[PDB]
Every structure is written in C-alpha cells, then in structure tokens.
Amino acid sequence: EVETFAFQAEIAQLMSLIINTFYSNKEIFLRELISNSSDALDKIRYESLTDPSKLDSGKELHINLIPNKQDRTLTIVDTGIGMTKADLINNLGTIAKSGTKAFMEALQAGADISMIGQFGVGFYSAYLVAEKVTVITKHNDDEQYAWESSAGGSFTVRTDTGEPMGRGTKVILHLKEDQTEYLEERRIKEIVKKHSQFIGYPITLFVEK
Numbered sequence: 001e002v003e004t005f006a007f008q009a010e011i012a013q014l015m016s017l018i019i020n021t022f023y024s025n026k027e028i029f030l031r032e033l034i035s036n037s038s039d040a041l042d043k044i045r046y047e048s049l050t051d052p053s054k055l056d057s058g059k060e061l062h063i064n065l066i067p068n069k070q071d072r073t074l075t076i077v078d079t080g081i082g083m084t085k086a087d088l089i090n091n092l093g094t095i096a097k098s099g100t101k102a103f104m105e106a107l108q109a110g111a112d113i114s115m116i117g118q119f120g121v122g123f124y125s126a127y128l129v130a131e132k133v134t135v136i137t138k139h140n141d142d143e144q145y146a147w148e149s150s151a152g153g154s155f156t157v158r159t160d161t162g163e164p165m166g167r168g169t170k171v172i173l174h175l176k177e178d179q180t181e182y183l184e185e186r187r188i189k190e191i192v193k194k195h196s197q198f199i200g201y202p203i204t205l206f207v208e209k
C-alpha cells in the first residue's frame with residue numbers, strides 16, 4: 001500500500017530551485033546529510049540518558065557511507081533516533097516551511113546554496129546530485145517506513161518490507177548520470193575530510209566489491 005502526498009508549495013519551490021539553479025559546488029550535499037545524521041544520533045543519545053531502554057533497538061551510534069556503482073546509489077546510514085510516520089508526513093514539512101522561506105529570502109539577498117543547512121532544510125541538497133531519494137527509517141515508537149521522491153511536487157510513503165533496520169535512517173541517493181564521481185572512494189574521502197572532519201560519531205566509508 002503506497003500513499004502519495006503533495007509537498008507544500010514552498011518546499012516544491014525549494015526543490016525546483018535546487019534542481020534548476022546553476023551551481024557547481026554540489027559536494028556540500030554530503031556535509032548536509034552527515035550533519036543531519038549526527039543530529040539524529042545526538043537525539044537518541046540524549047534520550048537514552050534518562051531511558052536506557054531506548055537503545056534496546058541498537059547500542060551502536062554510527063554513520064555508514066555505502067557507494068554502489070552497479071545500482072548508481074550512494075547510501076548514508078545512521079543509527080539515530082529515526083522518524084515516525086507523523087514526522088515524514090506532517091512534522092518535518094511544517095518546520096521546513098519557515099526554514100525554506102528564510103533560505104529563499106537569504107538567497108535573494110546574496111546568500112548561496114551552500115548555506116542551506118543554516119536554515120534547517122539541508123536534506124533537500126540531496127537533489128543537487130540525486131534524481132530520486134529514498135529514505136528508509138525506523139523510530140522506536142513506530143514501524144519501518146520508506147519515503148521516496150523524484151521531486152515533481154509529490155512524495156510517497158509506504159510501510160517498508162525490506163531488511164529490518166533496528167533503529168535509524170538510511171538515505172539512498174539515486175545519483176544523476178553525470179554525478180557518479182560521488183561513488184568514488186577518493187572523492188568521498190576528500191569531501192568527508194574537507195567538510196565533516198569533526199563529526200562526533202564514527203563515519204565508515206564502505207569499499208566497493
């Protein structure tokens with residue numbers, strides 16, 4: 001069972017701007033996604049100090065980067081707090097409406113796309129390099145869900161029947177045909193060292209077979 005939702009008009013406008021604006025410094029997408037993962041890990045860590053059973057779904061707090069040249073995907077996996085169905089459909093979009101408006105106004109005043117994370121909508125930088133993004137997520141209080149969007153104004157949510165994740169989020173970037181540099185080990189290493197060197201969780205870059 002697949003449910004299809006319309007983005008709020010403001011978020012659809014943001015995604016079109018990201019897809020259509022000429023902007024060569026695309027590599028910042030990875031910093032933004034790693035930052036989101038780090039924030040999600042911070043959140044479950046803090047909650048676990050007062051309810052240690054919140055880690056029954058997995059004690060390890062980490063970020064994995066998994067390139068796959070056969071599928072042309074880059075996957076960013078974290079074992080953070082995860083998101084509920086309500087997060088995916090309602091809560092995050094509500095927060096993203098105000099962040100988008102601030103970001104859009106900042107861009108009109110001379111900011112550039114790399115500053116997107118200062119407005120809390122860094123996830124959408126994924127569309128600098130991906131034609132489709134799939135988000136698989138599992139929160140302790142809800143079921144495992146798959147969110148997906150190729151932009152165009154809509155996204156889908158379904159219950160996920162794949163490999164159970166325990167807790168956390170996987171962002172699968174289905175890369176654009178001309179963005180396969182972000183599947184190369186040396187390129188990912190370079191970007192992590194440049195932009196994500198002090199993240200407080202282990203980042204493991206998987207090697208391809």
Ligand SMILES: OCc1ccc(OC2CCOCC2)cc1
Nearest residue numbers: 036037040092123135147169171
């Ligand atoms: O833990 C990583 C992560 C992944 C995606 C996120 O944002 C939502 C934005 C649009 O709706 C689908 C998900 C936030 C955090």
